[PDB]
Design an enzyme around this catalytic site. Structure first.
Site, short mmCIF file in Angstrom:
data_model
loop_
_atom_site.label_atom_id
_atom_site.label_comp_id
_atom_site.label_asym_id
_atom_site.label_seq_id
_atom_site.Cartn_x
_atom_site.Cartn_y
_atom_site.Cartn_z
N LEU A 23 -9.84 -2.61 -12.64
CA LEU A 23 -8.80 -1.91 -13.40
C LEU A 23 -8.88 -0.41 -13.13
O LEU A 23 -9.95 0.16 -12.90
CB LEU A 23 -8.95 -2.19 -14.89
CG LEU A 23 -8.99 -3.68 -15.23
CD1 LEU A 23 -9.38 -3.87 -16.68
CD2 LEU A 23 -7.62 -4.32 -14.92
N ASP A 66 -15.02 -5.21 -12.31
CA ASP A 66 -15.53 -4.02 -12.99
C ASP A 66 -16.98 -4.16 -13.44
O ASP A 66 -17.47 -3.32 -14.20
CB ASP A 66 -14.66 -3.68 -14.21
CG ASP A 66 -13.45 -2.85 -13.84
OD1 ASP A 66 -12.34 -3.41 -13.82
OD2 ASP A 66 -13.61 -1.63 -13.57
N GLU A 71 -22.24 -0.05 -18.90
CA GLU A 71 -22.24 0.67 -20.17
C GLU A 71 -21.18 0.12 -21.10
O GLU A 71 -21.35 0.15 -22.32
CB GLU A 71 -22.01 2.16 -19.97
CG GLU A 71 -21.65 2.93 -21.24
CD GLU A 71 -21.70 4.43 -21.03
OE1 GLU A 71 -22.68 5.06 -21.47
OE2 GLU A 71 -20.77 4.95 -20.37
N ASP A 72 -20.08 -0.38 -20.55
CA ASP A 72 -19.03 -0.85 -21.43
C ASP A 72 -19.41 -2.10 -22.21
O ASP A 72 -18.78 -2.37 -23.24
CB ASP A 72 -17.75 -1.08 -20.63
CG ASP A 72 -17.10 0.22 -20.20
OD1 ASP A 72 -17.19 1.20 -20.97
OD2 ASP A 72 -16.53 0.27 -19.09
N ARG A 91 -12.76 -8.73 -18.83
CA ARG A 91 -14.13 -8.23 -18.67
C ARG A 91 -15.11 -8.91 -19.60
O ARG A 91 -16.32 -8.67 -19.49
CB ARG A 91 -14.17 -6.72 -18.90
CG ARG A 91 -13.42 -5.93 -17.82
CD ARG A 91 -13.84 -4.46 -17.81
NE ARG A 91 -15.29 -4.35 -17.60
CZ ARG A 91 -15.99 -3.24 -17.79
NH1 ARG A 91 -15.38 -2.12 -18.15
NH2 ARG A 91 -17.30 -3.25 -17.60
N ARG A 138 -8.98 0.66 -25.27
CA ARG A 138 -9.99 -0.39 -25.18
C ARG A 138 -10.81 -0.58 -26.45
O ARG A 138 -11.36 -1.66 -26.64
CB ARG A 138 -10.94 -0.10 -24.01
CG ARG A 138 -10.23 0.13 -22.66
CD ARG A 138 -9.71 -1.17 -22.02
NE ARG A 138 -9.45 -0.98 -20.59
CZ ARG A 138 -8.29 -1.21 -19.98
NH1 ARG A 138 -7.24 -1.67 -20.66
NH2 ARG A 138 -8.17 -0.99 -18.68
N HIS A 166 -11.63 6.99 -21.75
CA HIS A 166 -12.68 6.67 -22.71
C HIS A 166 -13.19 7.99 -23.28
O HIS A 166 -12.97 9.05 -22.70
CB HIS A 166 -13.83 5.91 -22.04
CG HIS A 166 -13.52 4.48 -21.69
ND1 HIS A 166 -12.65 4.13 -20.67
CD2 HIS A 166 -13.99 3.32 -22.20
CE1 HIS A 166 -12.59 2.81 -20.58
NE2 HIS A 166 -13.40 2.29 -21.49
N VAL A 261 -11.78 4.28 -9.84
CA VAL A 261 -11.46 3.23 -10.80
C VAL A 261 -12.04 3.65 -12.15
O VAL A 261 -12.42 2.80 -12.97
CB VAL A 261 -11.97 1.85 -10.35
CG1 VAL A 261 -11.20 1.41 -9.09
CG2 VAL A 261 -13.46 1.89 -10.03
N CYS A 267 -21.48 5.36 -17.12
CA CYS A 267 -20.89 4.00 -17.14
C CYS A 267 -21.70 3.02 -16.32
O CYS A 267 -21.55 1.79 -16.49
CB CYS A 267 -19.45 4.11 -16.62
SG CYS A 267 -18.69 5.44 -17.51
C1 LIG Z 1 -17.06 5.09 -17.78
C2 LIG Z 1 -16.17 6.09 -18.17
C3 LIG Z 1 -14.83 5.75 -18.38
N1 LIG Z 1 -14.40 4.49 -18.20
C4 LIG Z 1 -15.26 3.51 -17.83
N2 LIG Z 1 -14.83 2.23 -17.68
C5 LIG Z 1 -13.80 1.88 -16.92
O1 LIG Z 1 -13.01 2.67 -16.44
C6 LIG Z 1 -13.67 0.39 -16.68
C7 LIG Z 1 -12.33 -0.01 -16.06
N3 LIG Z 1 -12.21 0.52 -14.67
C8 LIG Z 1 -11.18 0.41 -16.93
O2 LIG Z 1 -11.23 0.17 -18.15
O3 LIG Z 1 -10.20 0.98 -16.39
C9 LIG Z 1 -16.60 3.79 -17.62
#
Ligand SMILES: *c1ccnc(NC(=O)C[C@H](N)C(=O)O)c1
Length: 275
Positions: A23, A66, A71-72, A91, A138, A166, A261, A267
């Site tokens: 994503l 992903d 970390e997510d 995910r 999210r 995020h 991405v 992360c």
């Molecule tokens: C670290 C900082 C910001 N976002 C993430 N996670 C993602 O971006 C996962 C995925 N590619 C998405 O949600 O778009 C990690």
């Protein structure tokens, strides 16, 4: 007991499918998967070989593009691990291997199962004194409440997060009581909200590139303050700011491919202190 002390890190290799199928916030440049793998391998080398952490390396899954962004899927505080419920339903199969890794490390496991709750670990900033949780596309309020119920010793407050971001897209801890924060009006607006809601006054390290405000701070035995930050080649004006942390061992780490991405430094690992 010092803030940022870690003994262990969980990481996960990226699959070939990440290049086309992870994503991403916006259609942009082509991901060089080989280069992403090299950068990920160096990142793991810093945590394990250079800093001496015990690294658990989970294998890639081509059906979970992903899955490198561990970390997510888990938030660890002391000896308790919250297994999250990622905002993107596809995910959610990432939690399986994570739960097994953390159970083998003998952490107490709490699983976010509420069908109305979502939370990405990337939306969680743990300062050592409290949590801030980004309400984003999210992470929702119910997810925030379950985190607060899981870590009852710590205050938890929320902060609106914009767009396809995020919370830690523009901040992270750079030291004890020290929040690295981006310069954008959005990043500043969120920091103001966080500071108002807190009992504490945090010091700030302001960087001119929001994305470069995502760094990894560690307190390593016999080393002291350690900070992984984006390189001068990626973000020279933010690297200049990190250079003024003269009591930190500064380690430049490239992450330009995974940034495509939206994945940043924090992360890519889950850090654990097993004292
Ligand atoms: C670290 C900082 C910001 N976002 C993430 N996670 C993602 O971006 C996962 C995925 N590619 C998405 O949600 O778009 C990690």
């Amino acid at each position: 007991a010092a803030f940022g002390r870690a003994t262990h890190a969980v990481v996960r290799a990226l699959p070939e499918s990440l290049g086309q199928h992870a994503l991403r916030s916006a259609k942009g440049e082509e991901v060089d998967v080989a280069r992403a793998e090299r950068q990920h391998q160096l990142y793991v080398g810093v945590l394990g070989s250079k800093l001496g952490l015990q690294v658990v390396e989970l294998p890639a899954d081509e059906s979970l593009p992903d899955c490198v962004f561990v970390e997510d899927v888990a938030v660890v505080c002391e000896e308790t691990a919250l297994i999250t419920r990622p905002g993107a339903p596809s995910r959610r199969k990432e939690v399986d291997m994570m739960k097994e890794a953390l159970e083998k490390l003998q952490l107490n496991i709490v699983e976010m199962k509420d069908e109305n709750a979502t939370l990405d670990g990337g939306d969680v900033l743990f300062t050592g004194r409290e949590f801030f949780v980004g309400l984003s596309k999210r992470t929702n309020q119910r997810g925030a409440e379950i985190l607060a119920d899981t870590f009852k010793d710590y205050a938890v407050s929320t902060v609106p997060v914009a767009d396809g971001l995020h919370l830690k897209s523009f901040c992270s801890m750079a030291g004890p009581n020290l929040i690295a924060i981006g310069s954008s009006e959005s990043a500043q607006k969120a920091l103001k909200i966080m500071q108002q809601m807190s009992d504490h006054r945090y010091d700030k390290l302001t960087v001119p590139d929001d994305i470069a405000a995502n760094c990894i701070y560690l307190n390593i035995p016999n080393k002291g303050h350690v900070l992984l930050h984006r390189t001068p080649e990626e973000y020279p004006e933010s690297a200049k700011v990190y250079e003024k942390l003269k009591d930190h061992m500064l380690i430049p780490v490239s992450m330009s491919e995974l940034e495509k991405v939206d994945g940043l430094l924090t992360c890519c690992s889950v850090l654990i202190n097993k004292k």
